[PDB]
């Protein structure tokens, strides 16, 4: 089997991407944030504290003839941005772009933190990291990909995120029309539960490539590119007036600037992030100070190849017995 679904930016800045997902019988369609940096499929629901729902579409298990309470199971998760959610668990039929999993754990939120409430466009998350990170207790549950894998034509999914435009998540096949050149594959460590790999270096604009190992994660659920302070300083030093602002919480730059590109290495291959991808607009409405899309990972404890990086590439998440990651230009 295969599946193919379009993923759409939630706003004009590509702060996140939503993909429609069918849950239950008859189908209830929710727009979920596909997140290769976590492993829980959770939704706003009829059980979510009413004051914490503000415009989201909810899953109502009592209206699904295939929903079953997973008795005794609970879940609770906290994300790198400080947000969180928790609740109980149902199993139900879940379909993405024509690909159907029966008996998928659907984690129903009883509580969500303010940032989820305040974002009316995201109805929940669909985790695509390794199932060892799933938070369901006392019986850990499998991700949608893990459950689908054996049925797929090939044990892969691909992320093709757009810049200020829709893109595609495919399951079970590689669309050879969706990228240019060849796909370069690189080793993955699953020891922390993430799609963790090592970039071979970087360049700033038309500058020379610096060969240096940068361990990090491929994370579709993080907006920006978070790299070591040395790398980030070298980038922003090429933008007149750019500076790190403690008050704002990162590098800012004059909105009048034209930003240089940023290149990262995948083996002997190179992915180029155009400068415009690195512009996240005014820090506050009407400001002439703009927020940078490349930020320091210092004090995160891990480097994160988030959407800024991933949307410059066609990315293969290869869930074969030994997982790997593939990157192509597009």
CATH of the domain spanning 175-330: 2.40.70.10
The answer for residues whose C-beta is within 8 angstroms of residue 21's C-beta and 6 or more apart is 5, 29, 30, 31, 32, 94, 95, 96, 126
Phi-psi category of residue 82: left, alpha or beta, with phi > 0 → left and psi -120 to 50 → alpha? left
**193, exposed or middle or buried, with CB in 10 Å at 0-12, 13-18, 19+?**
middle
CATH number for domain 5-174, candidates 2.60.40.10, 2.60.120.330, 2.40.70.10, 3.40.1360.10: 2.40.70.10
Q: How far is CA 291 from CA 54, 192, 243, in A?
A: 27, 30, 10
**227, exposed or middle or buried, with CB in 10 Å at 0-12, 13-18, 19+?**
buried
Task: Output phi, psi for 222, to 5 deg.
Answer: -110, 135
268 CB-side CA count, 13 A: 1
Residues of the chain with CATH 2.40.70.10: 5-174, 175-330
| Cβ-contact 299, 217 below 8 angstroms | no
The tokens of 23 are what?
A: 């849950």
| Cβ-contact 284, 297 below 8 angstroms | no
Catalytic residue list:
35, 199
């Amino acid at each position: 089997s295969t599946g193919s679904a379009t993923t759409t930016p939630i706003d004009s800045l590509d702060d996140a991407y939503i993909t429609p997902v069918q849950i239950g019988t008859p189908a209830q369609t929710l727009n979920l944030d596909f997140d290769t940096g976590s492993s829980d499929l959770w939704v706003f629901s009829s059980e979510t504290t009413a004051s914490e729902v503000d415009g989201q579409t909810i899953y109502t298990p009592s209206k699904s003839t295939t929903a079953k309470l997973l008795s005794g199971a609970t879940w609770s998760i906290s994300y790198g941005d400080g947000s969180s959610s928790s609740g109980d668990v149902y199993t139900d039929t879940v379909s993405v772009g024509g690909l159907t999993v029966t008996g998928q754990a659907v984690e129903s939120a009883k509580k969500v933190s303010s940032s989820f409430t305040e974002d009316s466009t995201i109805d929940g998350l669909l985790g695509l990291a390794f199932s060892t990170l799933n938070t369901v207790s006392p019986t850990q549950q499998k991700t949608f990909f893990d459950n689908a894998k054996a049925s797929l034509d090939s044990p892969v999914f691909t992320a093709d995120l757009g810049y200020h435009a829709p893109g595609t998540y495919n399951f079970g096949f590689i669309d050879t029309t969706a990228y240019t050149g060849s796909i370069t594959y690189t080793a993955v460590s699953t020891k922390q539960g993430f799609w963790e790999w090592t970039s071979t270096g970087y360049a700033v604009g038309s500058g020379t490539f610096k060969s240096t190992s940068i361990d990090g994660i491929a994370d579709t659920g993080t907006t920006l590119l978070y790299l070591p302070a040395t790398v980030v300083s070298a980038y922003w030093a090429q933008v007149s007036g750019a500076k790190s602002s403690s008050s704002v919480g990162g590098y800012v730059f004059p909105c009048s600037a034209t930003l240089p590109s940023f290149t990262f290495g995948v083996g002997s291959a190179r992915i180029v992030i155009p400068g415009d991808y690195i512009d996240f607009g005014p820090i506050s409405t009407g400001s002439s100070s703009c927020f940078g899309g490349i930020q320091s990972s210092a004090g995160i404890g891990i480097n994160i190849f988030g959407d800024v990086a991933l949307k410059a590439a066609f990315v293969v998440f290869n869930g074969a017995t030994t997982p790997t990651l593939g990157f192509a230009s597009k």
